[PDB]
């Protein structure tokens, strides 16, 4: 058929009732209660502001008292193998013999830097060194142990198939066969968190990232109307389905340009494109703001929010302190519990540069980056990478990037690709949820809180 | 003189590019669909991206900026290369200019303005490359070039040589009209014309 | 197929200080010993890696394996004091015999 055919069909048998404009329905109330409880724990105060090698030690120690107890709790006395004994030892250097063993130690790899980053530095340098050959004039592809008295060779099959990067903490137990090299047979990770109970009328959340509002491209603008038309109920009508979505969740890069070379006028001039579509989407449906690696904000993870600035000057209203439940900015890593569900969001700039380095070993799809992000949520360290994604003073003596409760859905952004994964570890729950850009591929991800069952929205 | 200088600058700068553009004078790939073209412009129009035709452009808007204290009239005129002939005569009328707020009101107004242009040049036929080129005219009321140069302009600083080669890069000279929606805002009394064939 | 040219050898000394006051030879000792020697021009391929380290060691029963490891492409060798070390030098300059010493 034509597309008059449909026209004729949809618009002539249009119902016009339920729209009576006096007696509108009211949204689904959904409260974050983080929003005034305790204990903000990535506001750190700028003016404050090498520390690295502290938090190392910190980290190093927190995560070899956590295997430490793990192996108590599994590789206890009595625990036997197959025909020998099962023993355990302090030092790396201790286990020499025809018999299994268990020790803690931290792994050390390769883990080498891609080229495409090497040149994208290097042509704004002024006068560096080849980098290329700083990889080239070495002979390369081997897994070892440290732990501060030698490093053994960890050869293996179980470790093959598995995904390492060096400064993380296991305590595999093996035993050597013809050389100085350990075996494997199981691997062990810390021992499991305390997460809150799931609760037992409800909403849902919308989670959307990428939008990358530039001077440049005005296909962005149009897919921004259509997406606040969509959220106001007036484009898919059906207000009994559209209602239970309490708020959005705007995870991070809302503008998109080039910090080299920029004026005021262009930031201004983006921020007044959001600030307009902001004006549109607030006095329906909450909103939070989420800042990431390509906005106006520090480059580090921990990022403040953006200001009370930068916003037209018609926003004051919201800005005054008092309506905070109807636009909350917030840092880029945060733990909402949104109506006692624990949901952590990151803006994604973790996995980015995980994936920014080429590792020799572990034989950029869909499973790669979920497999990422579930060892990410095992190893109880978000920032994997220390100097490439944290910055200077993170925190004393307690870090907040190594997790100390295990949340419900970890929700990641500034993906390529859409996907999901539910992951069980130690009888415990955790649905891992990328989430894809906006300006290509702009899906809009509708998240519930009564089956934790995310949908997508494709909007072309 | 204060705030419509910029105004005007930036309206007959979106004029010259749209002109260009939509009359295939300048390969459509080195123009892009932008906003910022270090003033802020009303509509997401295609601003070329080359050296010599910004600077060009400017000093074209700004003399002729200079000149309207005395000038009633710009037209931009389209002829061809293999035989001097004009082809297209776009006018742009400035009749008292209301010489001596609300800037959203004047970017809207210049919208809608463009938005006529752009929609008058949707229903002219193709053109071609190869030579088909542009010119400049314009009509004063009352002034007179190529006649400052009778004391040798001893120069001293930057605006003198500035006024100087632009009052001497003048040269003399001597169907359907179409009107089109001009800026009936206060300040700027702007009006549109049109000519074919 | 005949040999034409002169040996080469060199020689690189390492020398632990007090907070960087340029280690002179009369108060601080060696601590390392290395060597290369130049593959080309040698003749009678000989079984020595054309490379060594020699490291002093008091003996505590981890750092020569520690040292081992991270190398794992040259043999190194230990000795308990800084005369030992000289005498192997010697040794091994009189078992080579090279022509030019540089540095």
């Known amino acids: 058929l034509h597309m008059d055919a449909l026209l004729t069909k949809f618009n002539e048998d249009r119902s016009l009732q339920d729209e009576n404009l006096s007696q509108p329905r009211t949204r689904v109330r959904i409260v974050d209660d983080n929003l005034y409880n305790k204990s903000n724990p990535f506001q750190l105060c700028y003016k404050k502001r090498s520390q690295y090698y502290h938090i190392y030690q910190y980290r190093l120690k927190t995560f070899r008292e956590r295997v430490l107890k793990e192996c108590d709790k599994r590789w206890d006395a009595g625990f036997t193998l197959n025909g020998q004994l099962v ?85 595999i137990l093996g035993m050597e066969a013809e050389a100085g090299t350990f075996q494997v047979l199981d691997i062990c990770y810390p021992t499991p968190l305390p997460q809150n109970p799931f609760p037992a009328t409800r909403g849902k959340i919308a989670l959307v990232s990428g939008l990358n509002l530039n001077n440049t491209s005005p296909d962005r603008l149009l897919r921004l109307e259509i997406l606040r038309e969509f959220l106001m109920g007036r484009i898919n009508n059906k207000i009994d389905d559209i209602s239970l979505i309490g708020r959005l969740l705007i995870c991070g890069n809302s503008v998109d340009f080039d910090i080299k070379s920029v004026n005021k006028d262009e930031l201004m001039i983006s921020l007044t494109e959001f600030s307009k579509f902001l004006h549109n989407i607030l006095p329906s449906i909450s909103v939070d703001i989420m800042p990431g690696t390509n906005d106006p904000s520090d480059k580090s993870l921990p990022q403040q929010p953006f200001h009370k600035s930068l916003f037209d000057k018609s926003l004051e209203s919201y800005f005054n302190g008092s309506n905070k439940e109807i636009l909350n900015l917030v840092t880029n890593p945060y733990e909402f519990s949104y109506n006692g569900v624990d949901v952590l969001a990151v803006s994604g700039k973790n996995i980015n540069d995980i994936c920014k380095y080429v590792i020799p070993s572990n034989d950029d799809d869909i499973e790669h980056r979920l497999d990422l992000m579930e060892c990410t949520m095992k190893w109880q360290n978000i920032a994997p990478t220390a100097p490439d994604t944290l910055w200077c003073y993170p925190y004393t003596d307690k870090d907040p990037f190594v997790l100390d409760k295990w949340p419900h859905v970890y929700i990641v952004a500034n993906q390529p690709y859409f996907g999901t994964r539910v992951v069980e570890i130690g009888g415990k729950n955790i649905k891992i949820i990328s989430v894809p850009e906006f300006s290509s591929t702009g899906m809009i991800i509708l998240l519930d809180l009564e089956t934790l069952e995310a949908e997508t929205v494709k909007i072309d | 003189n204060r705030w419509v200088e910029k105004w005007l600058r930036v309206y007959l700068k979106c004029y010259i590019n749209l002109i260009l553009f939509y009359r295939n004078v300048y390969p459509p790939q080195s123009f892009d669909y932008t906003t910022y073209q270090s003033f802020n412009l009303p509509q997401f129009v295609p601003i070329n991206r ?148 | 197929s005949v040999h034409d040219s002169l040996t080469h050898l060199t020689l690189e000394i390492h020398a632990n200080t007090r907070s960087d006051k340029i280690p002179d030879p009369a108060i601080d000792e060696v601590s390392m010993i290395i060597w290369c020697l130049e593959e080309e021009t040698f003749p009678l391929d000989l079984d020595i890696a054309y490379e060594g380290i020699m490291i002093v060691h008091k003996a505590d029963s981890t750092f020569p394996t520690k040292i081992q490891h991270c190398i794992n492409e040259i043999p190194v060798m230990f000795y308990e004091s800084e005369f030992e070390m000289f005498e192997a030098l010697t040794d091994l300059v009189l078992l080579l015999d090279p022509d030019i010493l540089s540095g």
Not at chain 1, 90 to 111: A, R
Not at chain 2, 87 to 103: M, N, P, R
């Open chain 1, 87 to 171: 023993l355990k030892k302090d030092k790396v250097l201790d286990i020499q013999g025809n018999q299994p063993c268990w020790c803690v130690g931290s792994i050390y790899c390769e883990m080498k830097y891609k080229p495409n980053v090497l040149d994208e530095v290097i042509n704004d340098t002024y006068g560096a060194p080849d980098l290329t050959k700083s990889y080239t004039d070495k002979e390369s592809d081997e897994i070892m142990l440290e732990d501060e008295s030698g490093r053994v060779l960890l050869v293996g099959d179980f470790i093959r198939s598995t995904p390492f990067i060096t400064g993380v903490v296991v305590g």
């Open chain 2, 50 to 197: 080359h050296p010599a035709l910004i600077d060009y452009i400017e000093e074209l808007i700004l003399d002729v900026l200079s000149k309207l204290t005395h000038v009633y009239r710009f037209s931009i005129c389209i002829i061809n290369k293999k035989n001097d002939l004009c082809i297209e005569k776009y006018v742009l009328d400035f009749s008292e200019l209301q010489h001596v707020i609300t800037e959203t009101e004047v970017f809207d107004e210049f919208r809608s303005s463009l938005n006529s242009l752009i929609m008058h040049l949707e229903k002219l036929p193709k053109v071609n490359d190869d030579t088909i080129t542009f010119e400049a005219v314009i009509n004063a009321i009352e002034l007179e070039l190529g006649h400052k140069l009778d004391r040798n302009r001893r120069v001293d600083s930057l605006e003198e040589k500035a006024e100087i080669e632009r009052d001497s890069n003048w040269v003399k000279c001597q169907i359907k009209l179409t009107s089109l929606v001009g800026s009936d805002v206060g300040p700027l009394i702007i009006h549109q014309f049109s000519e074919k064939l």
